[PDB]
Amino acid sequence: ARIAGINIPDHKHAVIALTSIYGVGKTRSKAILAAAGIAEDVKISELSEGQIDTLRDEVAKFVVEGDLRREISMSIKRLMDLGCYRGLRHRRGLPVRGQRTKTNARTRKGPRKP
């Protein structure tokens, strides 16, 4: 089922399968099910339809994909269009957390440019 949106996590255990949501993680799923009166060893796929409509209802509390990434960027933008070291780092594509650029950064920055 689309559930939070599109995402059709099936043939898997309720927990993990539920984490498929672009906004929920292991912790959220392992707790959301119980709160929704749902087990974990249960395959959402073969899950009772009615029991699915419950997940959606409770998962709606947490922010996901849509409004998630939407705001997740807003924040960045803020400190970015502010002038703080954090922002500067973003526009420059360098590690904001404050790592070492002289070496190791293939993640934050592009690979090689010899």
């Binding site: 689309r2 599109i6 059709i8 849509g66 409004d67 939407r70």
Partner: protein
């Protein structure tokens, strides 16, 4: 003609006094929705065209008009002919019924829609806003489609001014943004 009647009823008069019109045969009438969706691309796939068409063929109860090029002098490419779109205007009943289809279930079936443009109008008094992405609304299945969609929509009313264009739609259920 569900919303159509509403026009003659609630609307018309609302404007007849607000806009202080003299003849009922003046009130800015709704002159067919247009719909276009300039899919373009083609070349790469060419099949996505009929796809964007079949999609529109669903969004609308009529038959899509796969348009062609015209100038040919296109950097992208294009050579006089060559498929590139599918307008597909609206037909009276289907038109208003459509004006109903959306604004009541389409615009409602948002993505984050927190208000609608209040300037998507023109100089004459016609509005045209892009959905940005086909909300999958009552179309051939839902999770069964293809790489996004999106399209354009234009109202076009006998409004002698953009202002009068506001009255119309406003008398209806145009969500807008304010």
């Amino acid at each position: 003609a569900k919303l159509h009647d509403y026009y003659k009823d609630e609307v018309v008069k609302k404007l007849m006094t607000e806009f202080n019109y003299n003849s009922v045969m003046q009130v800015p009438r709704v002159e067919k929705i247009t719909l276009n969706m300039g899919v373009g691309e083609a070349i790469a796939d060419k099949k996505l065209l009929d796809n964007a068409a079949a999609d529109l063929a669903a969004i609308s109860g009529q038959k899509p008009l796969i348009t062609k090029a015209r100038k040919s002098v296109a950097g992208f490419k294009i050579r006089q002919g060559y498929p590139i779109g599918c307008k597909v205007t609206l037909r009276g009943e289907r038109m208003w019924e459509f004006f109903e289809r959306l604004i009541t279930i389409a615009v409602p079936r948002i993505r984050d829609f927190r208000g609608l443009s209040a300037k998507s109008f023109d100089g004459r008094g016609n509005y045209s806003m892009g959905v940005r992405e086909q909300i999958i609304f009552p179309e051939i299945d839902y999770d069964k489609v293809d790489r996004v969609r999106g399209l354009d929509i234009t109202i076009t009313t006998t409004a002698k001014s953009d202002e009068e264009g506001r009255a119309l739609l406003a008398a209806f259920d145009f969500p807008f943004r304010k």
